[PDB]
Structure 1
Amino acid sequence: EYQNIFTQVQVRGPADLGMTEDVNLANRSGVGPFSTLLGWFGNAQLGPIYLGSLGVLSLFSGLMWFFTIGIWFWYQAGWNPAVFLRDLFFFSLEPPAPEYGLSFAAPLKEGGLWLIASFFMFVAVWSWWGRTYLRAQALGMGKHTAWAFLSAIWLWMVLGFIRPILMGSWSEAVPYGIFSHLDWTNNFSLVHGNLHYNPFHGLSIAFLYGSALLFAMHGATILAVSRFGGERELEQIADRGTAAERAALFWRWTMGFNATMEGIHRWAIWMAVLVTLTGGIGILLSGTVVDNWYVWGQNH
């Protein structure tokens, strides 16, 4: 039978310019081209996009961060394009050495540049957070997106800013590099006596696994009742239909309890935000309070 994974017949019409509400229409781009490719899987329309001061500041500040890491990689490559492509994943922009402590006085080639890039990244991320808030506010929506985004920002703030400060050395931050930042992750665990025995790490894993579990359940459930229009979840909330009832009854008969069309999305948002919420706590306690998690674990 038909599985509703890919659209059978695409239909296209006049582009949707979207809701107005209190959005400043001066900052909306034009509509982009339709993508028959994306139409097989989702919507084919590209754009419009909103471009305010925060967006411009984020995009610009983010490209400076990208370009700063860039010129450093070209410098490590001796400006040779061949060496650049060969060792692209091996290049790394490292933080200042431990001797500089929390000083911004490290020369550029010894962590000064890492501090500059970190400044641009800091501005780009936080201006983008403000963006997610104001876009919801302009449309009169709740701020669930901005608050869920804070959970990711929390782990990112712990890894590269909060924890290094508490440790008293920028050298405790993560380096900018494909392979180099994997190695930093590996050493962090070895130094702190195996993160497997950090309970917040184990919790973080439970919610990471649990998020793949929950989205496979939810995604499979909505597609299984899409024959009753189940993906139209807002109206199912305001006016329960047979889609919401069958969805609930499948899971109630399967495991003994069930959700509502709204309630399942509170499960979803919390399952996901607890990943980076517990994780940021585990990392923050590593080296500041606990030096060896395996040893710490054996006393409790």
Structure 2
Amino acid sequence: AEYQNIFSQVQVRGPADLGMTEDVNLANRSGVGPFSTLLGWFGNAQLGPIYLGSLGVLSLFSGLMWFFTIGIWFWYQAGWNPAVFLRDLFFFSLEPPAPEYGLSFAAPLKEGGLWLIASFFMFVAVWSWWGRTYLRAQALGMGKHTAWAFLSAIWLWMVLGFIRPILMGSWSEAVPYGIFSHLDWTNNFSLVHGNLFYNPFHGLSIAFLYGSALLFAMHGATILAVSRFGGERELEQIADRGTAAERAALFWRWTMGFNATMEGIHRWAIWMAVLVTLTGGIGILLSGTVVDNWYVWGQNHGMAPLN
């Protein structure tokens, strides 16, 4: 059987590559990390360098404090026992305040105070990572597509942990920090709101989530299929269309009757992924605030049979 270009046959290692300067404040960029021969079989071997700076430190420190606050609660729930900690690791959970406390910050540290403290460090970590994702693009003169794409995921995350709890009137609506407990929360949410399958924006969100696996399978397979023509070098195919881009376009045109371009397939890609959490966040924001039983809402809107 022939070569499929899924793993490299030969690795070459040059010098370390320090990357573009543009307007990057080069004092804030670390040294280059070690090379990994394992990663080199599938992608690049070089680790590092990484840029830190101000929003970096803010994000990494707040993110460390978020992680550390949960970890100590898990060590406490384990009773400091290192064996119990590893037995019950997926069963520990830092739960939000109980419903009687509403939105008040008066809940005891064991009854939800540590969840607010943990959630504050998460808030700062994620939002400062967003600004970091914007500014790293700005320093290189790049478009802000990555920061605006990340904002769509933040929208769902903000709805789950912040906006919908406020609109529902209690922090008890928010997600607990824990492996199985956020799964129990996800299941319980659907039962309380009367089968989330009949939420039309959960339906849409799944369509775009399946579409993202569909589209990346199509795009990844396409580029590997034309990689024998240098089609993975997509920016030079945008600037100076080669036979790779034409064969890719004619495969899909002859298959399904229409096709993308090398630049335009990445617009389909970004929107297919962005719409997952955009429509998702709307579907959760409507749940309990506007519809408390989606199956019965489905019956009134012609998508489930009447009783």
Q: Work out whether the TM-score is over 0.5.
A: yes
User: Helix, strand or coil: the match of 1:47?
Assistant: coil
Supply the distance in 2 between the matched residues of 1:84 and 1:4 (Cα, whole angstroms). Answer: 43
CA-CA distance at 1:105 after TM superposition: 1.2
Give secondary structure in 2 for the equivalent of 1:223. helix
- SS of 2:12's partner is strand
Alpha-carbon distance between aligned partners in 2 of 1:83 and 1:5, rounded to the nearest angstrom: 42
Question: Are positions 1:175 and 2:161 aligned together?
Answer: no
Secondary structure, aligned partner of 1:11: strand
Paired with 1:156 and 1:196, the residues of 2 have a C-alpha distance of 20
Residue number in structure 1 paired with 2:284:
283
**Distance in 1 (alpha carbons) for counterparts of 2:185 and 2:33:** 41
Distance in 2 of aligned mates of 1:231 and 1:239: 13
Partner Cα distance (1:190, 1:113) in 2:
27
Shift of 1:83: 0.9
Q: Cα offset for 1:233? A: 0.5
Aligned to 2:166: 165
Partners of 1:219 and 1:11 lie apart in 2 by 24
Give the Cα separation in 2 of the matches to 1:116 and 1:37: 39
Q: Tell me the distance in 2 between the aligned counterparts of 1:91 and 1:32.
A: 35
TM-score w.r.t. the length of structure 2 is: 0.97
Cα displacement string for residues 215-244 of structure 1 (whole angstroms, at most 9, x for unaligned residues): 000000000000000000011001111000
Deviations 1:192-234 (A, max 9, x none): 0000000000000000000000000000000000000000001
Distance in 2 (CA, whole Å) between partners of 1:73 and 1:10 is: 43
SS of the residue corresponding to residue 208 of structure 2 reads: helix
- d(CA) in 2 for partners of 1:142 and 1:101? 42
Counterparts of 1:1-300 in structure 2, within 5 Å, are: 1-300=2-301
Measure, in 1, the Cα distance between the counterparts of 2:192 and 2:94. Answer: 21
- Whole-Å Cα distance in 2 between the matches of residues 248 and 177 of structure 1? 46
CA-CA distance at 1:283 after TM superposition: 0.3
How far the C-alpha of 1:23 sits from its partner, in A, is 0.2
Compute the TM-score of the two structures, normalised by the length of structure 1.
Answer: 0.99
Instruction: Show CA shifts across 1:22-50 (max 9, x none).
Output: 00000000011111111100000111000
Supply the distance in 1 between the matched residues of 2:14 and 2:186 (Cα, whole angstroms).
Answer: 49
Quote how far apart the aligned CAs of 1:123 are. Answer: 0.3
Distance across 2 between alignment mates of 1:9 and 1:84:
44
Measured on the aligned residues, the alpha-carbon RMSD in Å equals 0.5
Distance 2:79 2:36 in 1: 41
Q: 1:268: Cα distance to partner? A: 0.2
> Distance in 2 between the 1:288 and 1:119 partners?
24
Structure 2: gaps spanning 5 or more residues: 302-307
Measure how far apart 1:118 and its partner are: 0.1
| Alignment partners' CA distance in 2, 1:224 and 1:281 | 38
Cα offset for 1:15? 1.0
Instruction: Report SS of the residue matched to 1:4.
Output: coil
Q: Distance in 2 between matches of 1:45 and 1:79?
A: 39
Write the distance in 1 (CA, Å) between the matches of 2:233 and 2:83.
52
Q: 2: CA distance between counterparts of 1:105 and 1:23?
A: 45
Per-residue deviation, 1:270: 0.2
Alignment deviations for residues 46-71 of structure 1 (CA, whole Å, 9 cap, x no partner): 11000111111101100100010111
Q: Is the partner of 2:84 in helix, strand or coil?
A: helix
User: CA deviation digits over 1:259-294, x for unaligned, max 9?
Assistant: 000000000000000000000000000000000000
How many residue pairs get matched? 300
Unmatched runs of 5 consecutive residues or more in structure 1? none
**Aligned residues with identical type, % of pairs:** 99
**Shift of the alpha carbon at 1:80?**
0.8
Give the CA deviation at 1:117.
0.1
* Shift >3 Å, 4+ stretches: none
